[PDB]
Design a protein around this ligand. Structure first.
Ligand SMILES: Nc1ncnc2c1ncn2[C@@H]1O[C@H](COP(=O)(O)OP(=O)(O)O)[C@@H](O)[C@H]1O
Ligand SMILES: Nc1ncnc2c1ncn2[C@@H]1O[C@H](COP(=O)(O)OP(=O)(O)O)[C@@H](O)[C@H]1O
Ligand SMILES: [Mg+2]
Ligand SMILES: [Mg+2]
Lengths: 386, 386
């Protein structure tokens, strides 16, 4: 069959979508593409939205729509032919092979989700199937792409299991609905096949009555704590407390070891200080407590105990002074004894992991609370805020 | 003005939307207006060798009519009796009117059309409020009900979530039993003015897979609600083999008028005078109490009636048989009874039968089930079937 410029194979089916939709493997202009046939009485294409993207800067992780065309009964859309969807990346054998790690994948999808939003474009159907795995491009690498934006069902809403609770109270509505879905996807990737709600049949029902659950995340691991406090922030029943896409990118979830070590450093430099007794210092001491494991001077290694024993100065039941001690030993790292650098460092990876693995809640605890200074220039790398 | 002769239809005149892109319009077949359903061959297949079986035997008043099927390049069309609405609009649309017919005979009709299907060995597989239709005012004004959308097979999972029998999701080939289940849900759906047994939007199919069931609207002391409950909970039975056939449902006391029930009590009594008791049959209707009798039925009857049979006899009081026996006899000479006795009882045969039925809400239920040993017998053919 042909409509020109597409052009697809009658029985070369790629899969089946909702409301009769069907996707084939086709050609355009001479390259290989994917052809999605839609019933105009079911799905309404957003020309004014696809137009905005076309005329703005192109994003690596937001798929392209080469062109659209129609016949008597259908509307056709030519879309980059991808290898598979996120569901095959998560649930399938030893995949291929992969190419990108889960975390970078999450980041890419988020960047794209922030790109749409920057143009006032709500996907309102983000899910494992609308996140595509590109084909091995050139060097053999592979990245991920959001698709199926611009399409919107009618009647004369997204996919069950990834719909935001407010959607079902009653008509668009806002970007905050994409974040919820993203939140669910974040967990899906990390848990490697699990949904937070979580079994398909009663999934959307659990969403409505807030029946969350994040088992696969350990309550006392640094990595899992960071992720949990984010995912749950994103799947918040209350749309008002869900982070924007830009905020998610600025989350410690995506920070490297050296950046984690930098935030710890800046915070110390930031709190030295005022009353304690001070709106700020109180906040990071409010959680206390068990973050420090009662007394941090007791849970740090032996050689380090001897070193900072010379002062004085460092409370031990205080979070702030733990931060102060880390800064101190970071800055003076080169001047320390050989036995101290031999358990501490090296910098920056091993060093930060040294306090990170003994105090799982430290980073998380500090990031929250320190939001009081998110409007400050020093913390722009860490918060964004808008 | 689209034409696929013999079938014609004008788009824009859309009546509804179905699954997998299915569309329904107003149209014409011969000279009369029909409904046109346009299905995608990739989503729904039609069962011709079934719709013809119907064609052979004479039309059933309560089964929809299929006038003709034809195809074009890209679709498959079907012409059906243009009805007015679905069972949903009947129930949920408060201020519907007239409502022409009565809800219980609505349920009767539906079960009949159903029994007609199963006699031809046709399994519906998708019974629900959207597949039970309300015809338009026929001539004078009378309204009837019709089952529709039989002979439609979904191409990959039959039916609709929230009306599918449990044995069809464990998978490891449907029979008539699956329809009874759906009917059972619909029955309750109509009786309770729009509630579901399982029983709310999103999680009613999950609750079906674990055996939930909650018929809160049915009062355990109301004689009416007790009969409805015995039947309704036997239709939605988790075990299919414990669900009645469509024909059994028709013979059920749930449809019996007042005077027919009285004739059934009278029939039951006349039939047991008697074996011993000491008697297979009599032992049966005595088994369940006692509890049905309320320990002593002579104690739960009106005052002037106690006086009348205080000196008799004979009238055990802890006996079900003798409870029926006293009703029969007070009828067999109701004509001669005093004044204050005929008053508290009659008039016949309606208020008379309610006198005993409201004071013993498990009497009819208990008897009808205990007296099933004579299902085949010719006295009890108006009542049983088997
Ligand atoms: N651009 C594409 N490249 C390759 N496969 C695709 C593409 N778009 C869709 N598909 C395949 O077609 C299937 C149906 O897509 P769609 O009609 O959007 O429904 P859904 O995404 O809800 O499954 C998807 O599961 C996917 O595997
Ligand atoms: N013969 C008919 N007359 C009038 N309306 C109809 C008829 N058949 C179907 N419809 C309408 O079309 C809608 C969609 O029907 P269908 O595509 O079979 O899906 P479903 O039966 O699950 O709703 C129904 O809700 C019904 O209101
Ligand atoms: Mg897709
Ligand atoms: Mg219908």
């Amino acid at each position: 069959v042909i409509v020109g410029k597409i052009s697809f194979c009658p029985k070369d089916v790629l899969g089946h979508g909702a409301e009769g939709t069907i996707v084939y493997r086709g050609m355009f202009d001479n390259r290989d593409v994917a052809v999605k046939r839609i019933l105009p009485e079911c799905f309404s294409f957003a020309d004014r939205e696809v137009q905005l993207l076309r005329e703005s800067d192109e994003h690596p992780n937001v798929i392209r729509y080469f062109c659209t065309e129609k016949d008597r009964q259908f509307q056709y859309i030519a879309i980059e032919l991808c290898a598979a969807t996120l569901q095959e990346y998560v649930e399938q054998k030893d995949f291929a092979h992969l190419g990108l790690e889960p975390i970078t994948l999450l980041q890419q999808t988020t960047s794209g989700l922030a790109h749409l939003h920057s143009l006032n474009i709500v996907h309102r159907d983000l899910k494992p199937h609308n996140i595509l795995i590109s084909m091995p491009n050139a060097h053999g690498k592979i990245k991920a792409m959001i698709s199926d934006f611009g399409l919107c069902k009618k009647l004369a809403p997204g996919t069950e299991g990834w719909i935001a609770p407010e959607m079902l109270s009653e008509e668009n509505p806002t970007y905050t609905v994409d974040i919820f879905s993203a939140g669910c996807v974040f967990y899906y990737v990390i848990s490697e096949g699990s949904h937070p709600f979580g079994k398909s049949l009663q999934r959307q029902a659990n969403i409505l009555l807030g029946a969350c659950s994040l088992d696969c995340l350990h309550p006392e691991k640094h990595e899992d704590v960071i992720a949990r406090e984010l995912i749950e922030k994103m799947i918040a029943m209350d749309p008002q407390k869900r982070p924007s896409a830009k905020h998610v990118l600025k989350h410690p979830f995506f920070w490297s070891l050296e950046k984690q070590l930098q935030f710890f450093q800046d915070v110390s430099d930031r709190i030295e200080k005022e009353s304690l007794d001070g709106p700020i210092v109180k906040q990071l001491e409010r959680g206390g407590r068990a973050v420090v494991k009662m007394d941090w001077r007791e849970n740090i290694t032996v050689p380090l105990q001897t070193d900072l024993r010379k002062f004085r100065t460092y409370k031990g039941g205080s979070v702030r002074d733990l931060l102060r001690a880390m800064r101190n030993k970071k800055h003076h790292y080169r001047e320390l004894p050989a036995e101290v650098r031999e358990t501490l460092g090296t910098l920056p990876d091993d060093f930060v992991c040294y306090f990170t693995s003994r105090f799982p809640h430290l980073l998380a605890h500090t990031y929250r609370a320190m939001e009081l200074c998110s409007h400050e220039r020093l913390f722009q790398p860490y918060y964004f805020h808008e």
